[PDB]
Amino acid sequence: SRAEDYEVLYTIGTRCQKIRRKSDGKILVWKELDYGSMTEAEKQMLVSEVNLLRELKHPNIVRYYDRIIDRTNTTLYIVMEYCEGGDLASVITKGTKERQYLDEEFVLRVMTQLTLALKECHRRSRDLKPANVFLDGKQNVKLGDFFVGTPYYMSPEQMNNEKSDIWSLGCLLYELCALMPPFTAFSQKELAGKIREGKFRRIPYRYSDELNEIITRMLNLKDYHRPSVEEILENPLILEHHHHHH
Numbered sequence: 001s002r003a004e005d006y007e008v009l010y011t012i013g014t015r016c017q018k019i020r021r022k023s024d025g026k027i028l029v030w031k032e033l034d035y036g037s038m039t040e041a042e043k044q045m046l047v048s049e050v051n052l053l054r055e056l057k058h059p060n061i062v063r064y065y066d067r068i069i070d071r072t073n074t075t076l077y078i079v080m081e082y083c084e085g086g087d088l089a090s091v092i093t094k095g096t097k098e099r100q101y102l103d104e105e106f107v108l109r110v111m112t113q114l115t116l117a118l119k120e121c122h123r124r125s126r127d128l129k130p131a132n133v134f135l136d137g138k139q140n141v142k143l144g145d146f147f148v149g150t151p152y153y154m155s156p157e158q159m160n161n162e163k164s165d166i167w168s169l170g171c172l173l174y175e176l177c178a179l180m181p182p183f184t185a186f187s188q189k190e191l192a193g194k195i196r197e198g199k200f201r202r203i204p205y206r207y208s209d210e211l212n213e214i215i216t217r218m219l220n221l222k223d224y225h226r227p228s229v230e231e232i233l234e235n236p237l238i239l240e241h242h243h244h245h246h
């Protein structure tokens, strides 16, 4: 459980790094947290949060393996699973650039696997946005945990609840299909206006009426009209092959 046990291969983002465990060569990543400027109170909060990450064990949640303290650089390293497919944000950006919509099959995989991730989070009782959803090398979808930005996915009620998570999932799935979020605007007040009206374009026609129907239900203005996790998973669209596979 020391940094020396691992070799940094290179930096993914800014710090998050792809690393290799020396003992068996296993590829992982770690996230660097400089706690050198924190108070004792903040470090305590950090410790409890990290111990709670360690408890989450689910195929559709990014696996956290270890925590490493290097008192020399006052740096904490959270070691986690490597997701070779990167994040959903990049996938959506790629789709726009190459002017190519994503397969309905892929959207169904994300819907299925993220719904299961949410079901697990709710049972244990993480913002649902494309940058916080990762793809491994086997078509599996994993939920991670990362002012200026526009709050595209904020639910009507949250702007005034497990059904709020369903709204957010709805926005994410809509954006995967349309390559844009269901409500866009240049200011938050304008955005809020659009959200309260609850109107949006149908996802593109290449997608089935069945898929459009469920995403639209998730975007209902009334939280109680949005489908539950259980009701989503009962949908005839969702099949075994859309779930995770080792």
Ligand SMILES: COc1cc(-c2nc(-c3cc(OC)c(OC)c(OC)c3)cnc2N)ccc1C(=O)O
Pocket (backbone or CB within 6 Å): 012, 013, 016, 029, 031, 062, 080, 081, 082, 083, 084, 085, 086, 087, 090, 134, 143, 144, 145, 146
């Ligand atoms: C659990 O949350 C995190 C996951 C990761 C993480 N990121 C990547 C990753 C891989 C890429 O290409 C191979 C990327 O480029 C598109 C990429 O862009 C953001 C990310 C792979 N595996 C991972 N486990 C990183 C950080 C976090 C976090 O919560 O801070």
Ligand SMILES: [Cl-]
Pocket (backbone or CB within 6 Å): 096, 099, 100, 101
């Ligand atoms: Cl397009």
Ligand SMILES: [Cl-]
Pocket (backbone or CB within 6 Å): 102, 103, 104, 105, 206, 207
């Ligand atoms: Cl398709």
Ligand SMILES: [Cl-]
Pocket (backbone or CB within 6 Å): 201, 202, 203, 204, 205
């Ligand atoms: Cl359209």
Ligand SMILES: [Cl-]
Pocket (backbone or CB within 6 Å): 059, 060, 140, 244, 245, 246
């Ligand atoms: Cl898996």
